[PDB]
Design a protein around this ligand. Structure first.
Ligand SMILES: O=c1[nH]cnc2cnccc12
Ligand SMILES: [Co+2]
Ligand SMILES: [Zn+2]
Length: 328
């Protein structure tokens, strides 16, 4: 068995190896990369996402989200308060203001300490889930807007044509902006490219130990757990590495820097935070290996969890479809 400790692996593809996306994901998995739930891919030195990021200030963040926390420092929930629209230019200025800027710190470790100590006492603003792409049309390798669609993968594996499209999303971050503990919709893969700016720190639980995190989450968020069988789908729960360690939950951490890809694997619970102003692009994808995870994925049917999903539940989980559809 490759990667038995479930360590987060870092890959350095050659330009030749960067030419076939599916092939390289399969290669990574042949080395046990998936067992960690998360992998870093450093692109070839001659590769670039686009020419410059000098012309992105006029992008609109239609609904910036202020992330308001409740609970204790190491165990909290966050809700999203809608704010008025602003451009990326205006958001960048806000991120860099005294109120929101990254504080002085010695290193990544110091910054992590400051995040978990202080996160709940501030409410940063996040430009999340903006449909669009910053990859240049002429970028032919690992262009997140030119990946094979999940609908086409499902069709190729299961022989059924389905409706739906899947397109990339942009995420404009600032210091303390947070992504809560979750797996992807239908336990899909995700790929995330950090286009520009300050780093993003990730935490991840190995897929083979996902149910351990769920069990702890039910204990730590008893109210939310009673309300919904798969409340982590709401993407509101944060648990610190110190608390995970106290409870014996296996996990790993890694910091992603500008110009680097991260891939999350089926049923790999993950969470994290941004160091400062940055922009990431992400999309879900599937491989043949995903199908069996899709079949087993837990669903939020309470209504809280946030189009393409219909067909995946309909085909892969026909028994769950009616009840799930009532929640929607
Ligand atoms: O960077 C991220 N921002 C918001 N949500 C996420 C969910 N999963 C992974 C990364 C992110
Ligand atoms: Co995710
Ligand atoms: Zn729910």
């Amino acid at each position: 068995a490759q990667n038995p400790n479930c360590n987060i692996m870092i890959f350095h593809p050659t330009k030749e190896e960067f030419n076939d996306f599916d092939k390289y994901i399969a290669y990574m998995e042949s080395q046990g990369a998936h067992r960690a739930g998360l992998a870093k891919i450093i692109p070839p030195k001659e590769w670039k996402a686009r020419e410059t990021y000098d012309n992105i200030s006029e992008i609109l963040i239609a609904t910036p989200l202020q992330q308001v926390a409740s609970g204790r420092a190491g165990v909290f929930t966050q809700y999203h308060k809608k704010k008025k629209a602003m451009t990326v230019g205006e958001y960048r200025h806000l991120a860099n203001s005294k109120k929101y800027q990254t504080p002085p710190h010695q290193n990544f470790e110091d910054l992590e300490r400051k995040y978990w100590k202080n996160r709940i006492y501030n409410s940063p603003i996040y430009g999340a889930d903006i449909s669009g792409s910053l990859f240049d049309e002429n970028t032919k390798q690992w262009n997140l807007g030119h990946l094979g669609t999940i609908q086409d993968l499902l069709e190729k594996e299961c022989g059924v044509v389905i409706e739906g499209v899947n397109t990339p999303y942009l995420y404009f971050g600032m210091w303390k902006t947070t992504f809560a503990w979750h797996t992807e919709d239908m336990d899909l893969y995700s790929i995330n490219y950090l286009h520009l700016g300050e780093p993003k720190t990730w935490y991840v639980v190995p897929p083979e130990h996902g149910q351990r995190l769920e069990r702890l989450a039910r204990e730590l968020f008893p109210g939310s757990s009673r309300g919904c069988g798969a409340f982590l789908r709401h993407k509101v729960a944060l648990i610190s590495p110190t608390v995970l360690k106290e409870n014996g939950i296996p996990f790993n951490r890694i910091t992603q820097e500008a110009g680097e890809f991260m891939v999350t694997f089926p049923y790999g619970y993950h969470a994290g935070f941004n160091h400062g102003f940055n922009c990431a692009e992400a999309i879900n994808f599937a491989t043949p290996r995903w199908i069996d995870y899709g079949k087993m994925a837990s669903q939020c049917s309470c209504g809280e969890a946030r189009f393409s999903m219909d067909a995946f539940v309909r085909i892969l989980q026909p028994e769950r479809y009616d009840l799930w559809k009532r929640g929607q």
